[PDB]
């Protein structure tokens, strides 16, 4: 069984490289962040440009939706995160306290907290309602590439250029587990599986790995793509067949069979590094986004 993703829309409008695309949980929007300091909102199904959200003073590396699809948080090189009301476009809060670029962000399922990772090598946990920093974790000894809550909000997984993935107890901020791989390649991305049992981790040696983190055991590895230079997002695609999806530095979208690790599709058409992919929560739809020589977002649709 293999998917058949085909290009359906190309979304242009960002004026520098795109950094991140995410589908709203209610399925109807795509948000995109860019080095052009902007967030844009698009219709998930027809690619209709909806709006631009502005106010960060420098570029944005990541953006994330609240559970109810009403808010976004963005992480910027201006050392802040910003919480936005999606419908109004207004900045509700500015989260200050990181001392360097903010690289990554996520809401917990409750969407009462935001977690962020920074070039300042820390992970911060923030109160959505007040915008105040609740915890600062000395999580790593190099820039933090990714942060993600598990399914119940009780855990955070972080990844860093120091080569480590760490699992943190959200409520206490204390480290529950460190995963080290073999030869400590920088870990450029990490996120829990939907069922909360695994973490999917990208390392800058052209490798994705599926780990059982309680056991500290690698269960699957995925290769064949080029990932040595950028922190490229990776996804569990669960709407049809169970795939692993990732951008690649060869301008392609790679899709792997989660179980057999075989490449099942390569999506051609971006003309620069595919820095970000996202999988639609209910339809077999992939959003992909590329760097400076492309600066567009592409939406692909499959029957499975």
């Amino acid at each position: 069984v293999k998917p058949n993703y085909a290009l359906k829309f190309t979304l242009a409008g960002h004026t520098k490289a795109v950094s991140s695309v995410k589908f709203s949980p209610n399925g109807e929007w795509l948000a995109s962040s860019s080095a052009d300091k902007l967030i844009k909102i698009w219709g998930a199904y027809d690619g209709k440009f909806e709006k631009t959200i502005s106010g960060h003073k420098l570029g944005i590396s990541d953006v994330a939706w609240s559970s109810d699809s009403n808010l976004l948080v963005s992480a910027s090189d201006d050392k802040t995160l910003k919480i936005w009301d999606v419908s109004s476009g207004k900045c509700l809060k500015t989260l200050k306290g990181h001392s360097n670029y903010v690289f990554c962000c996520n809401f917990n399922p409750q969407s009462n907290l935001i977690v962020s990772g920074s070039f300042d090598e820390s992970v911060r946990i923030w109160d959505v309602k007040t915008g105040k920093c609740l915890k600062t974790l000395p999580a790593h000894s190099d820039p933090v590439s990714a942060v993600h809550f598990n399914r119940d909000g009780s855990l955070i997984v972080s990844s860093s250029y120091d080569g480590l993935c760490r699992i943190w107890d959200t409520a206490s901020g204390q480290c529950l587990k460190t995963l080290i791989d073999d030869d400590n390649p920088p870990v450029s991305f990490v996120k829990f599986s939907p069922n909360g049992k695994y973490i999917l981790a990208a390392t800058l040696d052209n490798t994705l790995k599926l780990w059982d983190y309680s056991k500290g055991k690698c269960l699957k590895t995925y290769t064949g793509h080029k990932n040595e230079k950028y922190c490229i997002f990776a996804n569990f695609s669960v709407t049809g067949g169970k795939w692993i999806v990732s951008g690649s530095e060869d301008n392609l979208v790679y899709i792997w069979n989660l179980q057999t690790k075989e490449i099942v599709q390569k999506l051609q058409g971006h003309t620069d590094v595919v820095i970000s992919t996202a999988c639609h929560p209910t339809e077999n739809i992939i959003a992909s986004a590329a760097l400076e020589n492309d600066k567009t977002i592409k939406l692909w649709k499959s029957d499975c």
Binding site: A35, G59, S61, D77, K229, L291
Partner: peptide, 6 residues
């Protein structure tokens, strides 16, 4: 920036 590699 995520869009830069150094």
């Amino acid at each position: 920036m995520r869009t830069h590699t150094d």
